[PDB]
Paper text:
The reaction center (RC) and light-harvesting complex 1 ([name]) form a RC–[name] core supercomplex that is vital for the primary reactions of photosynthesis in purple phototrophic bacteria. The RC–[name] supercomplex comprises an RC surrounded by the [name] ring that is made of multiple αβ-heterodimers. [name] collects photons directly from sunlight or from the peripheral antenna, light-harvesting complex 2 (LH2), and transfers excitation energy to the RC. In contrast, some Rhodobacter species, such as Rba. sphaeroides, possess dimeric RC–[name] core structures, representing the largest photosynthetic complex in anoxygenic phototrophs.
Genetic deletion of the [name] gene had no notable effect on the oligomerization states of the RC–[name] complexes, suggesting that [name], which is not involved in monomer–monomer interactions, is not essential for dimerization of RC–[name]. The Type-2 dimer (3.45-Å resolution) adopts an asymmetric structure, with one monomer consisting of 13–14 [name] subunits and the other showing a widely opened [name] barrier with only 7–9 pairs of [name] αβ-polypeptides (the last several pairs exhibit poor densities), completely exposing the RC QB site.
Residue numbers in the entry:
A (entry chain a), B (entry chain Q), E (entry chain d): 1 to 54
C (entry chain 6), D (entry chain 7): 1 to 46
F (entry chain l): 1 to 281
G (entry chain 8), H (entry chain aa), I (entry chain ab), J (entry chain b): 6 to 49
K (entry chain h): 1 to 260
L (entry chain m): 2 to 306
M (entry chain C): 6 to 69
N (entry chain c): 2 to 69
Amino acid sequence: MSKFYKIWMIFDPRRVFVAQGVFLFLLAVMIHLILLSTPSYNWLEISAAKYNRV
Amino acid sequence: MSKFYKIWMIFDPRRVFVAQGVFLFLLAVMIHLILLSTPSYNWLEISAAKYNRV
Amino acid sequence: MSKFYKIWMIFDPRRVFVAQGVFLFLLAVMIHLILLSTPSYNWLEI
Amino acid sequence: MSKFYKIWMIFDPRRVFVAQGVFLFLLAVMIHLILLSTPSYNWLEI
Amino acid sequence: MSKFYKIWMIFDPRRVFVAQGVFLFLLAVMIHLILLSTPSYNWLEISAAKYNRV
Amino acid sequence: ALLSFERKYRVPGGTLVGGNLFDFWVGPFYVGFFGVATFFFAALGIILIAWSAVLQGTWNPQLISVYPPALEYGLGGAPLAKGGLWQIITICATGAFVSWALREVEICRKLGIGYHIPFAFAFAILAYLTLVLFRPVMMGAWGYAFPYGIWTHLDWVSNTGYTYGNFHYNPAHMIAISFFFTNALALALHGALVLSAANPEKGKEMRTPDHEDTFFRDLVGYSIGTLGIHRLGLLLSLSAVFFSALCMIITGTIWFDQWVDWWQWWVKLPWWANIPGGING
Amino acid sequence: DLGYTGLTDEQAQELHSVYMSGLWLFSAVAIVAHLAVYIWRPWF
Amino acid sequence: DLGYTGLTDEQAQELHSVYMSGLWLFSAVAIVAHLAVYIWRPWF
Amino acid sequence: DLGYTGLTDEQAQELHSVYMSGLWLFSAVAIVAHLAVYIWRPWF
Amino acid sequence: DLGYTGLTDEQAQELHSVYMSGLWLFSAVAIVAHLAVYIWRPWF
Amino acid sequence: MVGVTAFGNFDLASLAIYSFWIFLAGLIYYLQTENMREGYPLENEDGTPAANQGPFPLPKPKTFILPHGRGTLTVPGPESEDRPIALARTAVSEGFPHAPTGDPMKDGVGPASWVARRDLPELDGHGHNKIKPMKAAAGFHVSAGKNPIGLPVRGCDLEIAGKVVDIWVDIPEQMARFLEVELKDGSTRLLPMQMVKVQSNRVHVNALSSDLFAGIPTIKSPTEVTLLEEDKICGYVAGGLMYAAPKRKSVVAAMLAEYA
Amino acid sequence: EYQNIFSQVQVRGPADLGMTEDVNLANRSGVGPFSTLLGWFGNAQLGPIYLGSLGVLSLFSGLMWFFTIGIWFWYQAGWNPAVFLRDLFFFSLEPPAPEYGLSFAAPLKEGGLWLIASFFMFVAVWSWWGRTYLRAQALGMGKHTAWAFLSAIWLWMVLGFIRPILMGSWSEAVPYGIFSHLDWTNNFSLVHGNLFYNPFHGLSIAFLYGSALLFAMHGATILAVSRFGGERELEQIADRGTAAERAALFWRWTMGFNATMEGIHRWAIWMAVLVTLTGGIGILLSGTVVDNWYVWGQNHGMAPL
Amino acid sequence: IFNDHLNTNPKTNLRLWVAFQMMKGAGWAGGVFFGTLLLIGFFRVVGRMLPIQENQAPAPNITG
Amino acid sequence: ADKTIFNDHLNTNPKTNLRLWVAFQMMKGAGWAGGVFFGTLLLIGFFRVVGRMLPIQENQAPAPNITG
Ligand code: BCL
Ligand SMILES: COC(C)(C)C/C=C/C(C)=C/C=C/C(C)=C/C=C/C(C)=C/C=C/C=C(C)/C=C/C=C(\C)CC/C=C(\C)CCC=C(C)C
Ligand SMILES: COC(C)(C)C/C=C/C(C)=C/C=C/C(C)=C/C=C/C(C)=C/C=C/C=C(C)/C=C/C=C(\C)CC/C=C(\C)CCC=C(C)C
Ligand SMILES: COC(C)(C)C/C=C/C(C)=C/C=C/C(C)=C/C=C/C(C)=C/C=C/C=C(C)/C=C/C=C(\C)CC/C=C(\C)CCC=C(C)C
Ligand SMILES: COC(C)(C)C/C=C/C(C)=C/C=C/C(C)=C/C=C/C(C)=C/C=C\C=C(C)\C=C\C=C(/C)CC/C=C(\C)CCC=C(C)C
Ligand SMILES: [Fe+2]
């Protein structure tokens, strides 16, 4: 972590911030979707089972 | 958190605000549709079974 | 909430109002069609 | 049909337009209610 | 191993760093998915069995 | 983020809707009002495909499939889990395609070139709408449209073809196939010819259009020219798509039996219908 | 030239032109609505 | 005072006042419509 | 010192203050909506 | 002093300081979220 | 060899499909690198080289040997505008339009732009000029379709700008390229064939209005046209589409303007 | 507005006999008539056509192939012109039955005539390829047309020659006849399971649709920038004008990347070549390596079960 | 003060002026109609409140 | 563009002239939107009517893809 600031001498901050925001949003969507895919951790479904919705 | 204002020295507010509006509407629609897909939290059907519209 | 008027120092009202009208009509049509799709709330069939 | 514009030399546009708006809304409401009354065309129940 | 710095006299750091980031993220995703595929090391299902969520 | 010559062409104006609200570029892309619409629709469609994959249960991209409503739902709506997602994704896809065409129109206007390209794209859009909108509506159900899967819309193609026996016996289909094949041949010939003219034998000067015309008159005895060949390519591609759309609009709509029976009309012509011998009779 | 309201011929002609334009726009929208309804559920 | 469009403070304030008046009128009509629908056929 | 959009420090500070005010208003409305939904039908 | 982007050392240091502050705020929120989830339903 | 697998399900078919994926990736790389021969390296909106230059590197230089002793061309290489651009940036941030400062149609910016090409006539394979006026072209004559010579030229404002005096023709292709139009002042300009709608009575030009017909660039020699003059004339006429819209006397355009 | 689809005026002058280098003008024939009907669309001039040694060989072989099939069609019709017109599309020149395998011992009425016609077609096509290469070489051009034709020939050979050899029977090849070869393709599909689930069949279809898409895009672009004289593409390669720049900027602002006035032709030639290349590979694999493509797809994650 | 609306041409300025007039009148009419509708709805809800479903009364008038 | 002759529309104060000019703007835009939507609706209806006119009901095809 000593001289990481020099990365901004290599990469334009605007493009890097745009790509990082896009990447983080897509990654979070992917992980939430993967969790929703499994029968456990499907918070909607296991909540429906816990409270006897169906 | 104080210096975050400097982001506006990086990005033109017009483009950022347009992108933000589009993204927020898209995300809201996505989440509402996801809720409508599941048999639970499908508020339409939860009510329709409540009042016997079938 | 008081200073929101300053948004009009950022955006030309003509473009904003055109976009707003198009968006509102589009959203209303979308929601009405979604309601018409479901067997319930399909007021015609109900 | 060309000379119909001369009707505006007879009637003030303000009164005529107000009466026209009221009449059109009233007629539209009447027809919609008539359709809603019949078991057919009662789009809600259909 | 000392003279490896001379690689930067061959490659522009911008392109190399972009390629490196993309490659590392791609490899990490690939390995995580491979682990998720097998019934063992599918940490989601291993834990669901351990705590009897089924 | 500009080409060496791009600077002098980035000027305001040439936009159908929105004044200069969205008259700006994002990187190389040109946004515009219809670009905003295209991005929204595309993003929504892709995320809904991912969500339908979650509902289906499989994460294999080739197995993901978004089936349309069954035939029992007619032309009405369906539950999102069993038909609704297909319809939402189809509305998104149609909106994205139309907005893409209109954005291309705006870019053509800003550059001062002719409107041939969005017009050409409109043919592909109309063929897609024939397969998804016009034919199912004409036929009476959304279950006649194709699923949105990589290998499952091929199942739709195969089943729809074999409903009518060998689909090769469709005349509006034969014409379209011949147009597609002629288009591929023309494209190969044109690309190869311009490359051989611009990249001649090693050490020699660049050849001229006169050499191209000479080569194709030597080969087959007719040269169509440069303007001619580009006109011909556009016409062949558009005609292929048009006749394919026709072939699928008349199938199951005004013709319901096996397609070889259609070809039986020529055999039954009065002045050779009864003569013995040959394959037919 | 009754002039019961005070409008001249040019003013009346302009007003009638604009009013008829609005009337024809309204009628066109009504016609497309009736066509849509008739296709959906004819009444004859 | 960025002035990307050229409006002054007074113009922006007046425009926002009128726009918010229109927005509140639209919202009021929407609210009465939702109340009527909920009375006719509640969704909760 | 750094500059990419031409805004000065004061303009950036004012813009950020107004934008954060709007963000917090939006977040407050979202929070009350989530509270209402959770009371009506909890998901945990 | 490569300067492929034209930023000087001071600008780069300031930008990195602010960016790292934002990164650590985001990471802190993520950590508290993961702790809450693990308490609610551990995955180990 | 039917059904035999080296490992898992991998067999000859899987080997072929995977080798094809590798080949396809290589081919896409090669094709894009070939497409990176003109317009690179990327520039900023002021003129300095950009920070972002692309995942694909620039290709090795290649040389074209032009015919008739015109020289050689080396691409990629040092490319410069070789002209002044009359534009002013509207906003500080990147990615916004540059507004024209003076007259866009004369400054040569926007849709009315032009490139500083070679100031020499175009030559066919034999060494003669590729485009010649028909009256100086031996044996050439109108073969079919409505003859445009002698028909009045009408501008986009429905006013007559002149009369057609001659047709310029491409000698090898035997297709007409330019019309020569003589104005009231007696001088003659050129108009590309692609911009005129030869009707029964008149030649109609929807790009330019009548008053702008004098603004078209002229040619040095009456018996030839160079590539640079071609570029200037074509850019002028085409940019008339956008920069002569007010003067254009169109019914539907007028209705849209009244609407807006 | 004028959309440049058709010429609105035709001019004609002295006929262009063509360039002259390393080419024997004796073989070049005379210039034919000027056709106004074609003059509306492209060049009106027909000929002159080069008739070399390979030209004569190709013409003779192709004439004999066409006439052989015609005579068999006549025999199949009972030599009745009315039946010949009534059953022109339904005739067939079938390959030898599977009983004979690859043997040349088939009777002339049940397989020999097919072998003779196949030999004639083989000679005609290969002589034509040699002709294309030699014509390119005479003018000093590159041999790109030769290699694209070579791709087409590769698919043709796999269909007719190599695959029957690998399968071990002449009955695997394609019968000469319109509906006969349509039925041949349909049966080839049905025998080997869905050909749809052949991955190389899918790639071939991908590149055919891509050929149509790319030619539509390129034709529309060039017609849209023809008002700047963009159709003179060799000139644009030599000296980049505003036509090339406007086309490149349209495609860059549309989809983020572009081609040059030359590289788009590399894209075109490859998007056309890969059709027959991948099709030949896929057909070669079918039957030889896979006997049921649906089951192969099921085992390779493509089919649901 | 904003004075940018003044840029629209006059004939359109009034082509919308009386749009405003006539339909404002019936916007008043619509207000009346929806007020009556909401009054009827309020009485329907109060009717849903009371224990009326348990015991109802026959028709006072007969033969319809 | 040319000024109107009746000039009694000019008697409205500028603020209400505004309160309708912008109405006019935003909702001219969504009048265009409504035109597009109803055009597509009419196109679908035309194809539905042509489908009725034809004898589809008597003989119709089974579902191409599985599960309808
Ligand atoms: C029920 C039928 C089967 C099927 C069976 C087959 C079979 C079997 C084959 C194809 C093949 C092809 N199919 Mg399939 N096909 C089906 C469904 C489809 C669908 C669809 C939407 O459903 C599509 C778009 C396609 C499309 C395609 C093409 C991509 C491909 C042919 C390339 C080509 O140009 O060949 C034609 C080009 C040539 C033959 C080149 C000829 C070159 C020679 C040199 C020409 C000599 C001319 C001669 C001398 C005469 C000249 C005379 C005068 C001089 C003019 N198929 C279904 C699943 N299809 C082929 C392929 O490659 O598959 C992998 C193939 O063999
Ligand atoms: C499946 O579930 C789905 C996806 C359907 C649900 C999704 C829901 C979400 C994603 C949709 C989001 C909806 C929200 C974000 C939309 C809210 C919109 C609000 C802002 C409505 C605003 C209305 C504004 C009204 C129409 C104002 C009109 C203006 C008046 C006419 C007066 C204007 C007069 C001007 C100001 C003149 C002044 C001129 C100067 C000189 C004074
Ligand atoms: C399956 O599960 C799924 C995938 C659905 C879940 C996925 C969840 C994740 C992936 C979604 C992520 C969501 C997060 C990242 C979105 C958070 C967004 C925040 C940032 C909301 C921000 C809102 C900002 C509000 C709207 C601000 C509005 C601005 C006001 C109107 C005032 C602006 C006035 C300007 C500043 C004028 C100033 C001008 C100068 C002159 C002073
Ligand atoms: C089951 O799912 C599987 C496991 C298959 C998928 C798993 C995949 C693995 C590979 C996930 C990988 C995750 C890693 C790669 C992602 C890490 C992301 C972190 C490192 C990104 C950091 C984000 C930090 C952001 C939130 C912070 C931004 C800071 C801004 C808010 C501050 C603004 C900076 C401005 C003010 C600088 C300007 C200063 C002046 C001088 C102008
Ligand atoms: C009235 O006019 C008359 C009757 C005089 C003449 C008109 C005749 C008409 C009726 C002729 C009709 C011809 C038909 C319609 C042409 C159809 C051709 C079909 C469509 C071609 C389809 C497939 C072609 C396959 C792929 C052929 C492939 C060729 C092989 C690669 C060559 C293999 C050569 C080997 C077998 C040679 C083995 C024998 C030697 C001795 C080793
Ligand atoms: Fe070309």
